[PDB]
Write a protein that binds this ligand. Structure first.
Ligand SMILES: O=c1cnn([C@@H]2O[C@H](COP(=O)(O)O)[C@@H](O)[C@H]2O)c(=O)[nH]1
Ligand SMILES: O=c1cnn([C@@H]2O[C@H](COP(=O)(O)O)[C@@H](O)[C@H]2O)c(=O)[nH]1
Lengths: 206, 216
């Protein structure tokens, strides 16, 4: 919806439920990560799904060995998550382990190629194109890129093709980002704003 | 005492508790407490039973707890994850070094504010680690040293790489490693080895542990 995904990283149920309920008419997918889950419990995922009728992407940056990755994905889909975000840096077997569980449980995997923060240039950026092609080779259809580096985003989009689905987070220009990505992830700009719906609204009007 | 600057975990053996149900996890851990005083708990157990399981292990077994959360997000998110983890009672947290120096400093900042420890993961043990991680491992380790990191995680599956990592971090740093490898040789470089399934899936957990320590 509106090609906008809310990154709900508040750490207490009250605030999280309030802000999410307040911007519901603008977005239809909520990305829930460890800040909220480690503070309130995995049950928060099914509750969000039920109360808001939205799809949930568990942003867990899965980055372990294949056997542990299997366990994490199983617990996450059992909790009701529609998709899970997995790091590609650990290699093909760790990613394939996640894809196998997603296939068995009827869910989806999003492959994180390049990260949006400064530190990303140190090691991740140098591997991003290759990580993206690895996903293509494995048959990954969903991807996550950096909104802070449209130059990198466009390369990534070229690699994965136009049939793929790509989302990006970080500070950028909604206009130019939604030029390579199917949707942008916005967090603090909304959930810390005095008026979240307005901030969300303020964002779409671009 | 082998080292006088930092006390060894009991028998230099760390249990990786990745069972997913509270009952089985608490049972196997209580059964090997005679040989191990340090337990590594990860997401398989925490996402199945809740973060409160960490305080429960501490209360019941008096063990040291390392949260193996492979922290791998941007600085702001990393801070929130570490804060929540230390609040749950973990003595240390494992964070990935590949997302960059700022993501790591974020974790160290919280660890400092709460008086806890950060372990930096440099090279992973599985086959896929050869694709991208191994190529950056030496650099990640040097980055750790420059940031002041004193605790590291390495691969038991590759003794030659463990030695090389030990070379980079110095003899004053603390190093632990997981994966299948010979305890004897691994312990020439690592201060402690991590063992999971070989112990927790055994018919007799205490026996598997006793056996491994004798192997050494
Ligand atoms: O490269 C990446 C991958 N993921 N995220 C995540 O997307 C959200 C962005 O939120 P923000 O708009 O408040 O900074 C947060 O949950 C964050 O961990 C990034 O910021 N950058
Ligand atoms: O490079 C690494 C980093 N961490 N672990 C973790 O250490 C434990 C090893 O368990 P295992 O002995 O049963 O294979 C598991 O929790 C696993 O996620 C590895 O195996 N390799």
């Amino acid at each position: 919806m509106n090609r906008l995904i809310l990154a709900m990283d508040l750490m207490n149920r009250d605030d999280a439920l309030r802000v999410t309920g307040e911007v519901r008419e603008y977005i239809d997918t909520v990305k829930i990560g460890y800040p909220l889950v480690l503070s309130e419990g995995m049950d928060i995922i099914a509750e969000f799904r039920k109360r808001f009728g939205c799809r949930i992407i568990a942003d867990f940056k899965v980055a372990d060995i294949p056997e542990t990755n299997e366990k994490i994905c199983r617990a996450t889909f059992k909790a009701g998550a529609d998709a899970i975000i997995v790091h590609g840096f650990p290699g093909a077997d760790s990613v394939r382990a996640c894809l196998n569980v997603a296939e068995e449980m009827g869910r989806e995997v999003f492959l994180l190629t390049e990260m949006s923060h400064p530190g990303a240039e140190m090691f991740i950026q140098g591997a991003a194109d290759e990580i993206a092609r690895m996903g293509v080779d494995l048959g990954v259809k969903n991807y996550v890129g950096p909104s802070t580096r449209p130059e990198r985003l466009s390369r990534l989009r070229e690699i994965i093709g136009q049939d793929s689905f790509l989302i990006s987070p970080g500070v950028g220009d909604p206009g130019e980002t939604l030029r390579f990505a199917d949707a942008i992830i916005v967090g603090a700009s909304i959930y810390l704003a005095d008026n979240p719906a307005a901030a969300a609204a303020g964002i779409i009007e671009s």
